[PDB]
Amino acid sequence: STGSATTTPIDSLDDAYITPVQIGTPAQTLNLDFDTGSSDLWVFSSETTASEVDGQTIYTPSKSTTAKLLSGATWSISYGDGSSSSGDVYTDTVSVGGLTVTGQAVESAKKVSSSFTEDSTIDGLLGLAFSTLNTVSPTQQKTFFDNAKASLDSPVFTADLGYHAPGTYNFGFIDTTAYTGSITYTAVSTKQGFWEWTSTGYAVGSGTFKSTSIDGIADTGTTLLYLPATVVSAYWAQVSGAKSSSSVGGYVFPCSATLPSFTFGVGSARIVIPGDYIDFGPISTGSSSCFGGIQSSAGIGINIFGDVALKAAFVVFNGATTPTLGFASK
């Protein structure tokens, strides 16, 4: 089997991408944030505290003839940005772009943190990291991809995120028309539960490539590109007037600037992020200070190849017995 679904930016900055997911019978379609940095499929629901729902579409398990309470199971998650959610668990039929999993754990939120409530466009998350990170207790549950893997034509999914435009998540096949050149594959460590890999270096604009190992994660659920402070300083030093602002929370730059590109290495191959992809717009409405899309990872503990980086590539998440990552230009 295969599946193919369009993913759409939630706003004009590409702050996140939503993908429609069919849950239950008859189908209830919710728009979920596909997150290769986490491993829970959780949804706003009829059980979510009413004051914490503000415009989201909710899953109502009592209206699904295939929903079954997973007795005793609870979940609770905290994300790298400080947001969180928790609740109970059902199993139900879940379909993405024509690919159907029966018995998928659907984690129903009883509580969500304010940042989720305040974002009316995201109805939940669909985790695509390794199932070892799933938070369901006392019986850990598998991700949608792990449940589907054996049925897929090939045990892979691909992320093809658009710049200011829709893109595609494919399951079970590699669309050879969706990229240019060849796909360069690179080794993955699953020891932390992530799609963790080592970039071979970077360049700023037309500058020379610096060969240096940068370990980090491919994370579709993170907006920006988080790299070591040395690399990030080298990038913003090429933008007149750019500076790190403690009060804003990162590098800002004059909105009048033209940003240079940023290149990252994948083996001997190179992925070029155009400068425009690095502009996240005014820090507040009407400001002439703009927020940068490359930020320091120093306070995180891990480097994160988020959407800013991934949207410049066609990315293969190869879930074979020994997983690998593939990157192609497009």
UniProtKB/Swiss-Prot annotation:
Which pairs are disulfide-linked?
Answer: 255-290
Q: Which residues form a coiled coil?
A: none
Please list the residue ranges annotated as the Peptidase A1 domain: 17-328
Recorded catalytic activity of this chain's protein: Hydrolysis of proteins with specificity similar to that of pepsin A, prefers hydrophobic residues at P1 and P1', but does not cleave 14-Ala-|-Leu-15 in the B chain of insulin or Z-Glu-Tyr. Clots milk
Q: Which residues participate directly in catalysis?
A: 35, 199
The answer, when asked if Ubl conjugation is one of the entry's keywords, is no
Q: Which terms are listed as keywords in the entry?
A: Aspartyl protease, Disulfide bond, Hydrolase, Protease, Signal, Zymogen
Documented EC number(s): 3.4.23.22
Q: Which GO terms describe its biological process?
A: proteolysis
Does the record carry Disulfide bond as a key word? yes
- What are the GO MF terms of this UniProt record? aspartic-type endopeptidase activity
| Family of this protein | Belongs to the peptidase A1 family.
Q: What is this protein called?
A: Endothiapepsin
Q: Which gene encodes it?
A: EAPA
